[PDB]
């Protein structure tokens, strides 16, 4: 038997275990709120041709007044947020932010630190394993939509089993040509183009007739609890900024093309429940990091 699996699900590195208490989550919540006001004030300043709205917003965020010849970098709040983001990503990242700093910045605004008000839908498709007989070839490509190319070289029809884990809520399979798919110890229905499957049903067997290759396009949707201020578009941009800025360069860590793949990969691991809670906080922090950096740019 030959085995294939999704590339992004391999070896999820551990996440940080620091700044996950009530005070720290409050600080990240405050950072997102003040970063959002920084972006809005910059727009209000530009349509109004006055620097007053931006100066006031920066003063709340950085606890200091902007001065010429000094680069506006966000002050102590930006420094704490950047180092905290590193700590969330990996367990090898240091913890160098004192508690008195977290408490001071958390008090700057009165917002709730609860990170489970709402939910979000994540599109990464988890393919844990695909097992095929000896005379068959299977290739898995993609994370937002997985294309599984299967070729049968032997004389007889082959049976290929699909495992989608137990985390995803729905998986939709579409084939280039109609194909047969059924659960274990179940009769195989007529060949169809699409299937809607619940991954908890069990391994799924697909008959691969000898001849032209069969390609299956997989789409999955999973629901993760997130704070009501969670915006997926901002989080993805913040994830790319952090990767480009070089603050995800830690020893013995994995790298992902999006925050979607990062959160799903951590979910599909041992003690995956606890990792997802830390990753959600990191997502909101990445939202704050994105908005702050766009408001105060560097070349």
């Amino acid at each position: 038997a030959n085995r294939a699996t999704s590339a992004f699900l391999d070896n999820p590195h551990p996440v940080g275990v620091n700044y996950v208490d009530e005070g720290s989550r409050q600080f990240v919540a405050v950072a997102e709120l003040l970063a959002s006001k920084l972006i809005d004030s910059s727009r209000e300043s530009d349509e109004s041709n006055s620097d007053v709205p931006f100066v006031q917003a920066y003063s709340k965020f950085a606890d200091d007044n902007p001065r010429h010849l000094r680069v506006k970098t966000g002050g102590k709040m930006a420094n704490a947020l950047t180092n905290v983001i590193r700590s969330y990503y990996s367990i090898n990242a240091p913890a160098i932010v004192p508690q008195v700093e977290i408490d001071r910045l958390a008090s700057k605004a009165t917002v709730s630190g609860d990170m489970y008000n709402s939910y979000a839908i994540f599109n990464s498709v988890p393919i844990v394993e695909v097992l095929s007989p000896a005379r068959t070839t299977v290739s898995i490509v993609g994370s937002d939509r997985a294309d599984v190319t299967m070729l049968n070289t032997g004389a007889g029809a082959a049976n290929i089993t699909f495992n989608f884990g137990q985390i995803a809520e729905t998986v939709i399979l579409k084939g280039s040509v109609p194909f047969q798919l059924a659960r274990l110890n179940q009769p195989m229905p007529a060949a169809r183009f699409t299937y809607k499957l619940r991954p908890l049903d069990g391994p799924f067997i697909v008959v691969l007739p000898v001849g032209n290759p069969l390609v299956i396009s997989a789409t999955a949707a999973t629901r993760i609890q997130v704070p009501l201020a969670f915006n997926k578009a901002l989080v993805e941009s913040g994830f790319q900024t952090a990767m480009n800025d070089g603050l995800f360069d830690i020893q013995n860590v994995n790298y992902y093309s999006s925050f979607d793949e990062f959160i799903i990969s951590q979910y599909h691991a041992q003690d995956g429940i606890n990792r997802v809670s830390t990753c959600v906080i990191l997502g909101l922090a990445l939202q704050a990091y994105d908005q702050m950096r766009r408001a105060l740019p560097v070349r």
Partner: protein
Amino acid sequence: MDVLSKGSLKELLAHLEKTPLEEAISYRIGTVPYQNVLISRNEYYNQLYPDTTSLIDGVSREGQRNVNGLIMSIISYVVSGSGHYIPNIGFMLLRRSILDILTKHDTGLVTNNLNYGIIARNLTVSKMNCEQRKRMLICFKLLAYKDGNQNDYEIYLNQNIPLKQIAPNFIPGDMRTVIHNQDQLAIVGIPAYRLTQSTELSIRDDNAKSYKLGYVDWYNSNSFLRERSEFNLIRLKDRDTKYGKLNGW
């Protein structure tokens, strides 16, 4: 922050008598020390600033579950403002004051085997400042007189000349010596210079600056006690009196 604001031997020793041992320990897991790390200092550089984690930073770090680790956490709290992560010590020890742990045999802790060379080496003493060294030498002196190791304390000081020059002069059993002492042991306070809201490159300096700016906020807050304005509102037990002396001294 409160411990770092003490400027005299009297105030520092009085604070240690009031505070319990649970303040010296921390319940946050933190990270491990003596690790080379790359931190982000964007106000100065675009790349990642190298540094080394230590026990003297103001961040909680994992500590060893022994008497050596307990003493290092106490001295770290005094000279840095935060301790280490040593859990399941026991409620009997955690209720007692920091001073009682340091200079009383009734607690039950055994500290005779402790060596000042490695403790100073581990609690990195080449990276401390003058005020931090003085506080550490106070803790060493209190421990030495607890276990009757005054001779060993003197020999250790004679080996290291700079430590002898700045070593505080007080006998742990006599209160007159504490009153007469005029060393300055304050690590945070109202600054004569211009203190700004800017970051520092090192981990130790950045955390120390956070405590300094934090003390200014606390000094001007409602929690501070202005003696010149509300001296008649404090209770009689905690009012400043010259007759007041430490228990057992």
